[PDB]
Design a protein around this motif. Structure first.
Motif, short mmCIF file in Angstrom:
data_model
loop_
_atom_site.label_atom_id
_atom_site.label_comp_id
_atom_site.label_asym_id
_atom_site.label_seq_id
_atom_site.Cartn_x
_atom_site.Cartn_y
_atom_site.Cartn_z
N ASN A 39 0.84 -1.19 0.00
CA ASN A 39 0.00 0.00 0.00
C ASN A 39 0.88 1.24 0.00
O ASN A 39 1.78 1.38 0.83
CB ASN A 39 -0.93 0.02 1.21
N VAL A 40 0.60 2.15 -0.93
CA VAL A 40 1.36 3.38 -1.05
C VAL A 40 0.56 4.52 -0.44
O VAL A 40 -0.63 4.40 -0.15
CB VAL A 40 1.72 3.69 -2.52
N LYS A 41 1.22 5.66 -0.23
CA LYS A 41 0.55 6.87 0.21
C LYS A 41 0.54 7.96 -0.86
O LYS A 41 -0.51 8.54 -1.14
CB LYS A 41 1.18 7.42 1.50
N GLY A 42 1.69 8.23 -1.48
CA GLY A 42 1.79 9.30 -2.45
C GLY A 42 1.42 8.84 -3.84
O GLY A 42 1.10 7.67 -4.08
N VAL A 44 1.81 7.44 -7.47
CA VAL A 44 2.72 6.38 -7.88
C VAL A 44 2.39 5.90 -9.29
O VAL A 44 1.23 5.94 -9.73
CB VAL A 44 2.70 5.21 -6.88
N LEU A 50 9.73 1.51 -4.13
CA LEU A 50 9.29 1.71 -2.76
C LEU A 50 10.34 1.19 -1.78
O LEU A 50 10.89 0.10 -1.97
CB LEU A 50 7.96 1.00 -2.51
N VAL A 51 10.59 1.96 -0.72
CA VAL A 51 11.50 1.54 0.34
C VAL A 51 10.64 0.90 1.42
O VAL A 51 10.15 1.56 2.34
CB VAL A 51 12.33 2.70 0.87
N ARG F 124 10.10 7.00 4.67
CA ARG F 124 9.99 5.79 3.85
C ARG F 124 8.59 5.21 3.93
O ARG F 124 8.01 4.83 2.90
CB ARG F 124 11.03 4.76 4.30
N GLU F 125 8.03 5.12 5.13
CA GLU F 125 6.67 4.66 5.33
C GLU F 125 5.96 5.62 6.28
O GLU F 125 6.59 6.40 6.99
CB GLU F 125 6.61 3.22 5.86
N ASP F 126 4.63 5.56 6.27
CA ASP F 126 3.80 6.50 7.01
C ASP F 126 2.51 5.80 7.42
O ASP F 126 2.40 4.57 7.33
CB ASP F 126 3.55 7.76 6.17
N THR F 127 1.53 6.58 7.86
CA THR F 127 0.23 6.09 8.28
C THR F 127 -0.88 6.86 7.58
O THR F 127 -0.63 7.83 6.85
CB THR F 127 0.05 6.19 9.80
N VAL F 141 1.60 2.46 5.64
CA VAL F 141 1.70 2.45 4.19
C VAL F 141 3.10 2.89 3.81
O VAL F 141 3.82 3.49 4.61
CB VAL F 141 0.65 3.37 3.53
N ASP F 142 3.49 2.59 2.58
CA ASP F 142 4.81 2.92 2.05
C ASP F 142 4.68 4.08 1.07
O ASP F 142 4.25 3.89 -0.07
CB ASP F 142 5.46 1.71 1.38
N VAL F 143 5.09 5.27 1.50
CA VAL F 143 4.88 6.48 0.70
C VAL F 143 5.76 6.45 -0.54
O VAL F 143 6.95 6.12 -0.47
CB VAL F 143 5.13 7.73 1.56
N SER F 144 5.16 6.78 -1.69
CA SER F 144 5.85 6.75 -2.97
C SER F 144 7.05 7.70 -2.98
O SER F 144 7.15 8.59 -2.14
CB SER F 144 4.87 7.12 -4.09
N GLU F 199 7.84 7.81 10.70
CA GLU F 199 8.16 6.39 10.66
C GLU F 199 8.09 5.75 12.04
O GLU F 199 7.99 4.52 12.14
CB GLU F 199 9.55 6.18 10.05
N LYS F 203 5.59 2.76 12.56
CA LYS F 203 6.14 1.51 13.06
C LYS F 203 5.27 0.91 14.16
O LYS F 203 5.18 -0.31 14.28
CB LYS F 203 7.57 1.73 13.57
#
Ligand code: MG
Ligand code: MG
Ligand code: MG
Ligand code: MG
Ligand code: MG
Ligand code: MG
Ligand code: MG
Ligand code: MG
Ligand code: MG
Ligand code: MG
Ligand code: MG
Ligand code: MG
Ligand code: MG
Ligand code: MG
Ligand code: MG
Ligand code: MG
Ligand code: MG
Ligand code: MG
Ligand code: MG
Lengths: 63, 55, 143, 141, 63, 206, 145, 56, 70, 54
Positions: A39-42, A44, A50-51, F124-127, F141-144, F199, F203
């Motif tokens: 699942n991404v946020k921004g 894409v 993705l990291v 790198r990741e967020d909510t 979630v993993d932010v682009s 993060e 986490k």
RNA sequence: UAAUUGCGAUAACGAACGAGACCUUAACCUACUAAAUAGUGGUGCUAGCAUUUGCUGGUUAUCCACUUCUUAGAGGGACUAUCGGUUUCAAGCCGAUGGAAGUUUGAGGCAAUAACAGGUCUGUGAUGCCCUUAGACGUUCUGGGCCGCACGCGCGCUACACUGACGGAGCCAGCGAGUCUAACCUUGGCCGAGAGGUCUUGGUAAUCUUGUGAAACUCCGUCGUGCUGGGGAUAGAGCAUUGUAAUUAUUGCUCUUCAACGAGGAAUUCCUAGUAAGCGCAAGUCAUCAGCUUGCGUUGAUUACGUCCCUGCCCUUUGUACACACC
């Protein structure tokens, strides 16, 4: 930290009731041949990278 | 102008416009043709005015 | 190689012409200097307090050189600025018609500008002479 | 009657016009060398065409540019365009084509809209707000 | 959303129906064709019809 | 570099670095490499420019926003908070001022430190606010990468704008400082803190 | 400009015209804490007293300060334009004054009482603690007193 | 005389309107249907488009 | 109105013996040393430039940049 | 005017010390808007009179 | 798909109103016709600085030529083109190349059938009925009031500053408007700190105001974080303009007085590119009065390019004892 690098394979759809979430399958460049949908946020597109801050964990439909 | 006669309702504005086209053509002619060119070629809708020499 | 004022940087050309008139002393500075405010749209008078009239004069002189002719109203509008009307919005306001008109007099008596036909004021041929002169002196600071 | 061309360049209202004759390499803008324009943070903006193609290519030509209308930035994007559009129009009639094609190539490859005039334009304000899309404030009671 | 209306597609159908011994794959000559063969009232309208006679001609050559 | 002087003379240091390496204000555009795998293809350097001012159409298509020079992307985000809306010429100079300060301390082309500061503060990741019904938890979630770059610019400039507010230090001084501390995360910078704490929260919901 | 290096001669807060003034602030602005002198009035007085504007109030040799006072309380004799002053064309003697620190509080009452004592509307309006200049009083001015 | 061209055409438009009004009230029983004005030298002409000109 | 609106000979020598090792020295940098206010800080920047100590690398108002001597 | 300044119970000070009547912070009061389609005339045009006219 | 816009499925086949077409405006023409009220080059005439030929101006006609820029006539141009992805390889849609332009090209104008007890008898010499009609609810004259102030609410304006105020200096727009039986837009010269005054002048206007030298903005200084030189409420004294009249102060200038306000609770508005926001300007109103509106250009971002969670409305399905239709 186990930094994991995975490349977007496909753009599937917009999850989240708001919609600002996109379902995306990725393939790691370190030892490929396994894919996992994340699942991404921004915003894409295909062939992004993705990291993933945790290697083995995936999710699905959001509310 | 606001379309409404009164003040009720959302404020709809409405722009009318009227276009004015002005042309001038210089001629060097004798007394006959000018008076012949002006008595005819008149037109309802075109304001024709014939000024005279360069002063 | 030849020179004009158009070959010199707009700002520091005036700063040299300003320093010139001072160094010369043939000025005819009105006398209400240090107390006049140069525009209604200003709060405080100029901070130079001995000067700022050479600068205005030098600024005026350069402007009239650049074009055919300028007037008193034309310099009131040029040097004018925005006036904060307290709690109300800003508006453009014209500058003092007496500082400029007395610049057009103190520079004409000094031989840099003549009362041109068509109205206004023209750069005097002796003004071009003096203006192009100190303009070339500026390019000798970077030679 | 020497070989000379004239071009232009328009940014959002401003039209910079440029006469390009054969000369000994001067570039003046309305009265003054290009080394003075002074918004001065965009000095290299109008220097750009002189460098994309090289400090030479001007030692045989004279350029002069006058700019009316616009604003303190609107015009600076016009003069850089009228300069490059002319250098590439001077090789259109007086030098060979393949050299002129080498100029458009070296210009458009970088191209902060150097030969191509930007089409953007201020959009009309509609009644109901102080701006084009901006609407007034409502309160619902 | 550039969905051509029926008046376009109705005219395009009716032209290919009877002028295949004309009307190649080039819109430019198709445009010029319409002004000689059809009575269209608008330069814009005619270019819309000709561009779509050109889309259909392209795919008829292809099944 | 084979000098040439025509009628209206072009200065030496002007003449010099122009038809040579097509560098920045006076900084080297080469040598600048994004120290991380991705955010390349999303950090601009090469193609080089002269100043960070461009009449570019980075808006009328989705991802063409990425092609804007990252330095210019920094400036754009500077000119805001209402009173500074528009006023790009202002921030353009603030960037030139800032790069020299970054240059002054601890060498390394400031156009490279900017790349370092950006890549170090992008989460790198967020909510996100997932409903779940009333009591909305937080889904990780993993932010682009594009949001990783954008948010890095917003976080940095904001961190400097509120810090430089109401104090003797100038915008460029705090802006440089923020970019300097963000080159390698110093834990004493507004952007690193907010990055890690995003993060951190992400986490605790995994 | 230049690097100055003065000795203990410079002194912090100094008193003149019955009020106190910060020594270590510029003197054109240091004078403004006196009620009746502002930024314009101050600036013209120091320009007249042959005083260096780039100095502070803490400097200014005691003769400079005493000169500064003498000009303020007599501007019409020291060539000050008589339209520069807070109280001109007086309503008793016609003379042009420039009321200073404690006097400017005194003349406000004298005027306000002149309007009240005459029962002029402007005075009646003052006595009611209202706005006088004619502004609307429906929506503005709710906390004041 | 001595008018501005802008005020002139607007003033001519008002003259047509008022001229039309006065006829729409006066020539109802005659099928009035409009007028036109022809401004020439020596004359100013008005044509009464009325279906029944025997009464007009 | 708090500490160093003035000259103070001991402060003058403080400046001379302390500008060394300032990789960055500017208006704000001089104020942060519990010392010269911004007004007399903008005067020190020209006096420390009268000879040696600081090298001008920036240009103008609202932003000064100086570096140790070489 | 001679009594206008004399008059006590006058000026800001007096009003400032009195309670603000609650009728200030009221509502629209709206007075019959949900009865708009119910004719109060009580008359009711007849079908014959409509067919005669329409 | 923006759209009963299309494709496709199809007991339907083929059609019209409305959408689209269309129209106006902003974009592209070195192609056509031209222009002393638009401008360019050259030549006279002409001043300044350089000299080695040069660089920068003056000269409503001293002449010659031209139409790139300006102007508006007739044409041209785009049709989502070429290619490639995607999809029932259908309508379409996404990417790249090209292009003045590829978001319905951008922005508008026009806009069917029907509904509302929406608003407007205070725009109308549009009008039914009712009231009134000479101590008038007619009309005019004088003065007052619509501005009245314990407070509640809405649109705004100006700010809390150092991406700043202030002072010099640079100096750039666009949409308009402007005087006949008249006093409109106003250059220029003087007098005045200012506001303004006075003498003249061009313009019924692409000709004169006006290049509307607008404002942010750019530049060099002064100030230094202190309610400070941020902020300009409140208030005193003085001088001018509009008008028959300015008191409850029409407006403008000057000095002085220097408040609240340290980014604002719960809440809530607006908006996706030359847009948002910042910024002034012209027009409407107007004797005088913009903190309003309608338009205009200047400087010019961040973030979406998604979804139905909130909200609002359309769609079927369904129920109805409603049809004056849930008032
Ligand atoms: Mg100014
Ligand atoms: Mg100005
Ligand atoms: Mg005071
Ligand atoms: Mg043309
Ligand atoms: Mg393209
Ligand atoms: Mg009702
Ligand atoms: Mg009515
Ligand atoms: Mg009356
Ligand atoms: Mg009212
Ligand atoms: Mg409203
Ligand atoms: Mg300023
Ligand atoms: Mg006087
Ligand atoms: Mg006359
Ligand atoms: Mg202030
Ligand atoms: Mg204060
Ligand atoms: Mg805020
Ligand atoms: Mg007005
Ligand atoms: Mg109003
Ligand atoms: Mg049923």
């Amino acid at each position: 930290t186990p930094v994991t690098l995975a490349k977007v394979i496909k753009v599937l759809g917009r999850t989240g009731s708001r919609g600002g979430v996109t379902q995306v399958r990725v393939e790691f460049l370190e030892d490929t041949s396994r894919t996992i949908v994340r699942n991404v946020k921004g915003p894409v597109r295909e062939n992004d990278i993705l990291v993933l801050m945790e290697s083995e964990r995936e999710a699905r439909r959001l509310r | 102008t606001r379309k409404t006669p009164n003040g009720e309702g959302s404020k709809t504005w409405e722009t009318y416009e009227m276009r004015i086209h002005k042309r001038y053509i210089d001629l060097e002619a004798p007394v006959q043709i000018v008076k012949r060119i002006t008595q005819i070629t008149i037109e309802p809708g075109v304001d024709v005015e014939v000024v005279v020499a360069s002063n | 190689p030849g020179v004009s004022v158009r070959d010199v940087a707009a700002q520091d050309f005036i700063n040299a012409y300003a320093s010139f008139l001072q160094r010369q002393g043939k000025l005819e500075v009105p006398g209400y200097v240090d107390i006049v405010k140069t525009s209604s749209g200003n709060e405080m008078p100029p901070q130079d307090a001995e000067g700022w009239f050479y600068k205005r004069a030098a600024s005026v002189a350069r402007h009239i050189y650049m074009r055919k002719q300028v007037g008193v109203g034309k310099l009131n509008k040029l040097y004018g600025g925005a006036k904060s009307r307290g709690v109300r919005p800003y508006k453009h306001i014209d500058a003092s018609g007496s500082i400029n008109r007395k610049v057009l007099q103190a520079l004409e008596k000094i031989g840099i500008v003549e009362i041109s036909p068509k109205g206004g004021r023209r750069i005097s041929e002796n003004g071009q002479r003096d203006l192009d002169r100190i303009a070339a002196q500026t390019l000798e600071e970077d030679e | 009657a020497v070989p000379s061309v004239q071009t232009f360049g328009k940014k959002k209202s401003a039209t910079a016009v440029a006469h390009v004759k054969a000369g000994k390499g001067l570039i003046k803008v309305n009265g003054s060398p290009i080394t003075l324009v002074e918004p001065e943070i965009l000095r290299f903006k109008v220097y750009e065409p002189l460098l994309l193609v090289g400090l030479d290519k001007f030692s045989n030509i004279d350029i002069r540019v006058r700019v009316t209308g616009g604003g303190h930035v609107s015009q600076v994007y016009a003069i850089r365009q009228a300069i490059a559009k002319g250098l590439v129009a001077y090789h259109q009639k007086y030098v060979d084509e393949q050299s002129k094609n080498e100029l458009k190539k070296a210009f458009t490859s970088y191209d902060r809209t150097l030969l191509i005039a930007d089409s953007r334009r201020p959009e009309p304000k509609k009644f109901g707000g102080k701006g084009a899309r901006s609407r007034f404030q409502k309160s619902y009671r | 959303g550039r969905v051509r209306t029926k008046t376009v597609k109705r005219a395009s159908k009716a032209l290919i129906e009877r002028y295949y011994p004309k009307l190649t794959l080039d819109f430019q000559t198709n445009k010029r064709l319409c002004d000689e063969i059809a009575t269209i009232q608008s330069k814009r309208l005619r270019n819309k019809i000709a561009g779509y006679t050109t889309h259909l001609m392209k795919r008829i050559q292809k099944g | 570099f084979t000098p040439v002087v025509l009628a209206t003379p072009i200065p030496e240091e002007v003449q010099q670095a122009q038809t040579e390496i097509k560098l920045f204000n006076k900084w080297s555009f080469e040598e600048v490499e994004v120290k991380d795998a991705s955010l390349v293809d999303y950090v601009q350097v090469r193609q080089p420019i002269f100043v960070a001012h461009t009449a570019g159409r980075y808006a009328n298509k989705r991802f063409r926003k990425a092609q804007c020079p990252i330095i210019e992307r920094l400036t754009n985000s500077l000119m805001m908070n209402g009173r500074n809306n528009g006023k790009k010429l202002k921030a353009v100079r603030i960037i030139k001022h800032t790069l020299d300060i970054i240059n002054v301390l601890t060498d390394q082309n400031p156009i490279q430190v900017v790349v370092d500061a950006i890549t170090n503060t992008g989460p790198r990741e967020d909510t996100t606010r997932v409903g779940g019904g009333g009591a909305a938890r937080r889904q990780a979630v993993d932010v682009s990468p594009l949001r990783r770059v954008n948010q890095a610019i917003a976080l940095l400039t904001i961190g400097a704008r509120e810090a430089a507010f109401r104090n003797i230090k100038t915008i460029a001084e705090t802006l440089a400082e923020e970019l300097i501390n963000a080159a390698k995360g110093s834990s004493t910078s507004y952007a690193i803190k907010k990055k890690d704490e995003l993060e951190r929260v992400a986490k605790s919901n995994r | 400009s230049l690097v100055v290096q003065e000795q203990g001669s410079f002194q912090h807060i100094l008193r003149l015209l019955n009020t106190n003034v910060d020594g270590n602030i510029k003197i054109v602005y240091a004078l403004t804490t006196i009620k009746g002198v502002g930024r314009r009035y101050s600036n013209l007085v120091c320009k007249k007293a042959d005083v260096d504007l780039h100095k502070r109030a803490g400097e200014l040799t005691q003769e400079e300060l005493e000169r500064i006072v003498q000009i303020m309380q007599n501007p019409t004799h020291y060539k000050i334009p008589a339209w520069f002053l807070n109280r001109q064309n007086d309503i008793t003697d016609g003379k042009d004054y420039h009321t200073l620190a404690n006097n400017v509080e005194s003349k406000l009452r004298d005027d306000l009482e002149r309007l009240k004592k005459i029962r002029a509307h402007r005075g009646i309006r003052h006595f009611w603690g209202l706005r006088v200049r004619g502004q609307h009083t429906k929506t503005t001015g709710r906390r004041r007193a | 005389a001595l008018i501005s061209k802008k005020r002139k055409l607007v003033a001519d438009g008002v003259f047509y309107a008022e001229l039309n009004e006065f006829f729409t009230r006066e020539l109802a029983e005659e099928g009035y249907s409009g007028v036109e004005v022809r401004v020439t030298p020596t004359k100013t002409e008005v044509i009464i488009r009325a279906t029944r000109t025997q009464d007009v | 109105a708090q500490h160093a609106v003035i000259l103070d000979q001991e402060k003058y020598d403080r400046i001379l013996k302390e500008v060394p090792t300032y990789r960055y020295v500017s208006v704000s940098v001089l104020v942060d040393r519990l010392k010269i206010g911004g007004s007399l800080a903008r005067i020190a920047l020209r006096h420390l430039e009268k000879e040696g100590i600081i090298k001008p690398i920036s240009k103008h108002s609202k932003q000064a940049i100086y570096t140790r001597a070489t | 005017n001679e009594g206008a300044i004399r008059d006590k119970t006058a000026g800001r000070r007096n009003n400032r010390s009195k309670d603000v009547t609650d009728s200030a912070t009221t509502k629209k009061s709206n007075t019959r808007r949900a009865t708009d389609r119910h004719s109060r005339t009580g008359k009711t045009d007849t079908k014959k009179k409509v067919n005669q006219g329409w």
